[PDB]
Structures are given as C-alpha cells and as structure tokens.
RNA sequence: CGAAAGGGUCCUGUAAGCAGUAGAGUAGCCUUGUUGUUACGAUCUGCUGAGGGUAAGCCCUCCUUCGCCUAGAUUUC
C-alpha cells in the first residue's frame, strides 16, 4: 500500500537513493549532513528512532523494532548486500576509466 | 554532413532515412530554425528584399557537428557501423 | 496469359488494415478487408469466404484478429444460369507452420 | 564537444539527447532517454534490467579483459596540442577499432560454442520419438511404383527413392474447409 | 607497438582461426517433425472451441469414405487391399 | 502501380522448450550418509539484446517473388 500512488514519481515525492544510504552506512559524517538538512522537532519521535537502511524515522523504539521484522526492511538489506549502482560501476560497464597520470 | 572537428564520413540523411520523406541525395540547404512548410512540400527561397541591419547576417557559421541519428525514435548512433560496434555480435551474425 | 480458373496463396497483413479500428468493429472490418483484398487481387466482385476462414478471423474474439493470415484465393467459374458475374473467388484459410516469411505462390491444379 | 554515456544503460549520449539529474549531494546523472530516466525515477536497478550494459557486464556477456579497452580514458592531465600526435592518434584509433571488432567476434563465438552439440542431441531425441511423422509414400503411390517396377524390370526401391525425392522437392500446404456446392 | 605484437602473436598461435552430413540430415528431419507438430496443433486450434461449446462426439458424426480413404492413403495403407467400399454404409 | 518478402531503422525487454553438483526445505529407498541417492520445489543460470512488433501518415530494394496496364462512362467556344 503506497499513499497517493498517482504522484509517486513526482520530484517533490522523491525518496533517498540507495547509494546515498550506502554512504550513510559507511560514513557517519554524511548521515550527519543529511540529518542537518532536517528539523528534529518536526521529525517522528523527535528524530530519536531512525533506520539508516530504509532512511526512515519512526515514532517509537517498538515501532522501529517491529519495522525491522518486515519485508521492506529485508528488501533494503538485500539490495544493500548486492550493492548500489554507482558511477564507477557505470564506467566499468562500458569499459571506461579515469586517467589521473 | 562531416565537419572539420567531426571526421566521420557521413551524409546528411539520418539513420533509417528522413521520416515520411526518404533520403537526401541531391544538394541541400541547411537553414537555421524552422520554415513555414511541412515535409515533402515545395519551398520557395528568396533573396532578402533589403540590405541587412544585424550582425547575425554578417556572422560566418562554423559547424562542429551535425546530428545524423535516427529521428524514428531515440537514436543514439550516428552510423550503422557505430551501432554495430556498440552492440557487438548478434545471433543472426553467427547465423549468417 | 493467365487463365480464368486459377488459385494462388497470399499472405494478408491485417495489422496495417485494422490499425486504429474501434474494438467492437475489428473482426467484421477484417472480414470486409479480406473480401476487398480478394476482389483487388482477382478482379472478381463476387467473393465467398470459407467458414473455417471466418472461425480463424474470429478465433480470439471480436478484437483479437491475427496480424497476418495465410489464405488461398481460387478464381473459379460461376456455372449457375443467369449469373451477374462469370467468375467468383473462394477464399480459404491455409494450414501453415508460420504465416510470416511467405511469398505469393501459385497452387498447382493437380 | 564530446560524446557522453548514459548512466543507466551505457548508450552513447550525443549533445541535446536525454536529460540530466542534478542531485543535492553534488552528483550529476546523465540519461540518454526518457526510458532510462523514468526507470531511474522508479528506482529500478540497471544491473538487474537485462537490456543494460551494466547487466551485460555483470553477467559476463561483454568483453572486458582486453588490451584494446585500455586506450580510452578520461584524461585529467592535458597534453599540449601536437598535429602529428593527433594524426597518429586518429590512425591508432581506426586500428584499435578493427582489432577490437575481431576480438569481440572471437569472444562471442567462445560464448556460443556448445549450441551445435545441444541442438544435435535434441534433434536425435525428437526423431527417435517421432519417426512415424517422417515423409512417406502413399499406398496408391507404392502400388503404382510396384507395378511400374514389374513392367519395366527396375528396382522398386529406386523408384521409391526417386518419388520420395520428388515429394520432398514439391512442397504443398493444406487448406481448411471446402466449398459447399449450391443447388 | 605492443598491441600489434600481441596481434601477431595471437595470429601465430591461432587465436582467430575458424573451423557433418549425418548431423545435417537429422537436423532437417527434426525440423520437418516440428513443422508437422505445428500443423497438428493448428488443426486442433481450428477444431476446438471448448470455452463456448462442447465438441460433438465422433460417434454422432458420419465420417466420409473419401476422407477416410485419403487419410489412410496418406498414412500409407493400401485401401484397395482391404476393401473400404463394402464396409461403408449408404 | 499494387500485394508479399528481404534488409534497415525504431519499440519492448530476454520467447517456447530443454538442461544444470544453483535452489529454503520436505518425504521416500538403501551404502544410513561420506554433493548418500531419488522425487517435488517459488525462484536462479545457460542456450537468448533473445522472441515479438515495425506504417497503418518510417526508409531502401530494375539486379527477391506474384499480379495489374494503352480502359469504361459523361461532357466540351
Ligand atoms: Zn529499515
Ligand atoms: Zn540510456
């Protein structure tokens, strides 16, 4: 069940990308900038309960724990284990490379 | 349709031909912008009635590239050789 | 040079003739296109369609007409007395493996 | 100007083709067409979409380990312009393209080696199961060839093989139904 | 120069080299069998309308002697040696 | 000129079928486990950028086939 499926693909309804989520998992600084672009008082649960893999805020720790048992979270985990598509892999697909000397 | 910086030996006709026209095998005029007619239509080209007043009439044009990809879709290749080189060997190539 | 009584096998490309037709009219329109095709090919305004050919046209309902169909058109002599036309065409469906990739071919009388 | 490549599918991206997505972390994504752009907006994986160079490289259907693929790179250290160097670069470019085409054909044939053996085995199994559907002579044809053999003193098997060859040469298709005679 | 030397070495080693009538015959026979299967399936599709109606039983339909003789002749049976005329009712 | 067909150009996204020491696990037979084995089993991999469609207002084809043709009727200082 997706809320308002007609306008899911609009730019104003865009969700966070998987490579950005991978960078959030690798480096806490990048996650810190992403959380700086938000306001904690408007966040669900005052921004205390956050799943990095789903890039999602939850209203309580019980809600976050219950979300971890669902298949969307496991689908995100499987996608992250397979790896996110990046510009470097796009380069390697066509056999291009960067020459820095 | 070749330029001094694009050294591909190719003609003005796009890949698959001009849509609903065919191929341009004669001399052609390339006009900036758009013209009142449609495809296949007779065009009358006239000399300007007055001496021009703009610098655009005085500019000399240097073309770097002319598109010859297919206009029957989202064409990404300027020549059939380029399409074959990007695609690789197909099943019918070994079948032949 | 061509005799009156003659049978040829054709491939009719019904897709380009039914392109854009209203869905409840596609199969009757295809029947009329087969009649018009046979009349153009044989010169006979009297065209008779085999019921198996009608079943083949209506095989997938009113809007599921095949893209290509292989037919045999047989120009024959109208032997009935007081006929308006001396010749007529009879159109049958042909059992082939694949209607694609076939040329027009004259069917042997024997 | 230069030829770019599509981020999603890897096709050449000539000027004024496709669309570029500017992301707020500083990354640009060039797409060659609306198909690639819309699949990106739906967050499909190019590695899983089988029509992409990403999938083909992940599946091993593209030649990747080859010496002819080392000559093209994004040159971040520029070279002072030299007419002889540019002309010899053009000649080397043509030669590299020819050698790459030959090696790609060899790679594809190495991929498609075993097809003949698999198809021959399938053909043998099908024939062994359906020998009764093979072309044969009619009973009346066999009768008339037998009485021709008796009349002419010839080999009945010889006229049978000749008629089988003629029947294989002459191909005829069956037509459904038949006309009903009018009163 | 290194690429050209590699090309010469591969051409000497036979990297670009390129390579049965019984196999051709059995492939042609299998193709004929597949064509016969397609024709049989087309016949079944023509005669079947099981979504909208049931097929009339074969015992309720009189079979023409000419069609039976033609089918047996195509199968390769001497119909004159068995005498199909005396069997057929009128 | 028409109808097919072939080639090109586009659109989709990898056909049917077969096979596989891929497949969570379950049940049998015995060497009672040593891919033990056989059977089933979403899916995965290979054959396969394959299959399908392509002018209906896409392009090319004296040199790929089959057919058509110097009419008929009406009228005119
Ligand atoms: Zn989660
Ligand atoms: Zn693309």
UniProtKB/Swiss-Prot annotation, chain E:
Name where it's found: Nucleus, Nucleolus
- Top-rank lineage group of the source organism: Eukaryota
Give the family from UniProt. Answer: Belongs to the TRAFAC class OBG-HflX-like GTPase superfamily. OBG GTPase family. NOG subfamily.
- Report the function annotation for this chain: Involved in the biogenesis of the 60S ribosomal subunit.
Listed name of the protein: Nucleolar GTP-binding protein 1
Q: Which organism is it from?
A: Chaetomium thermophilum (strain DSM 1495 / CBS 144.50 / IMI 039719) (Thermochaetoides thermophila)
> Which taxonomic lineage is given here?
Eukaryota, Fungi, Dikarya, Ascomycota, Pezizomycotina
What stretch of the whole protein does this chain cover? 459 to 552 of 661
């Amino acid at each position: 069940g997706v809320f308002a499926k007609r306008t899911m693909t609009k730019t104003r309804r865009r969700l966070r990308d998987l490579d950005q989520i991978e960078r959030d998992l690798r480096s806490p600084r990048h996650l810190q900038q992403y959380k700086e672009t938000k306001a904690a008082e408007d966040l669900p649960g005052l921004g205390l309960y956050y799943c990095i893999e789903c890039a999602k805020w939850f209203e309580s720790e019980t809600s976050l724990v219950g979300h971890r048992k669902g298949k969307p979270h496991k689908r995100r985990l499987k996608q992250l284990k397979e790896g996110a598509y990046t510009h470097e892999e796009a380069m390697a697909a066509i056999g291009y490379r960067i020459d820095n000397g | 349709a070749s330029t001094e910086t694009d050294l591909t030996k190719k003609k003005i006709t796009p890949m698959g031909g001009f849509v609903r026209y065919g191929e341009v095998n004669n001399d052609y005029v390339m006009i900036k912008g758009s013209v009142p007619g449609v495809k296949k239509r007779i065009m009358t080209l006239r000399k300007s009635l007055f001496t021009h007043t703009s610098r655009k009439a005085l500019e000399k044009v240097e073309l770097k590239w002319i598109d010859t990809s297919s206009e029957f879709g989202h064409g990404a290749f300027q020549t059939a050789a380029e399409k074959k080189q990007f695609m690789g060997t197909l099943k019918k190539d070994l079948q032949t | 040079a061509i005799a009156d009584v003659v049978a040829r096998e054709y491939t009719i490309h019904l897709h380009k003739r039914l392109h854009g037709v209203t869905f409840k009219k596609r199969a009757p329109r295809a029947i009329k296109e087969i009649k018009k095709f046979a009349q153009k090919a044989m010169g006979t305004s009297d065209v008779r369609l085999d019921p198996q050919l009608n079943k083949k046209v209506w095989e997938q309902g009113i809007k599921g007409v095949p893209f290509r169909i292989r037919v045999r058109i047989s120009r024959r002599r109208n032997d009935e007395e007081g006929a308006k036309e001396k010749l007529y065409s009879y159109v049958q469906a042909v059992n082939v493996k694949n209607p694609k990739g076939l040329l027009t071919s004259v069917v042997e009388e024997e | 100007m230069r030829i770019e490549n599509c981020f999603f599918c890897g096709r050449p991206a000539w000027p004024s083709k496709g669309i570029t997505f500017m992301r707020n972390d500083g990354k640009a994504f060039r797409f060659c067409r609306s198909k690639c752009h819309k699949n990106f907006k739906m967050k499909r994986n190019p590695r899983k979409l089988k029509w992409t160079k990403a999938y083909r490289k992940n599946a091993g259907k593209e030649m990747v380990v080859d010496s002819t693929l080392q000559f093209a790179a994004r040159r971040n250290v520029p070279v002072r312009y030299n007419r002889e160097l540019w002309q010899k670069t053009l000649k080397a470019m043509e030669r590299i393209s020819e050698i790459r085409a030959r090696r790609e054909r060899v790679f594809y044939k190495k991929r498609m080696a075993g097809k003949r053996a698999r198809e021959v085995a399938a053909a043998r199994k099908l024939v062994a199961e359906n020998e009764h559907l093979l072309p044969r002579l009619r009973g009346s044809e066999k009768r008339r060839l037998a009485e021709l053999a008796a009349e002419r003193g010839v080999d009945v098997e010889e006229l049978e093989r000749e008629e089988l060859a003629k029947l294989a040469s002459k191909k005829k298709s069956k037509a459904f139904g038949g006309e009903v005679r009018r009163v | 120069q290194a690429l050209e030397e590699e090309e010469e070495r591969l051409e000497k080693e036979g990297f670009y080299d390129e390579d049965d009538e019984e196999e051709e015959e059995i492939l042609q026979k299998a193709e004929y069998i597949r064509e016969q299967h397609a024709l049989i399936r087309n016949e079944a599709k023509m005669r079947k309308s099981l979504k909208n109606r049931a097929i009339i039983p074969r015992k309720a339909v009189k079979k023409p002697l000419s069609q039976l003789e033609d089918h047996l002749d195509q199968l390769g049976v001497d119909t004159e040696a068995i005498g199909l005329r005396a069997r057929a009712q009128t």
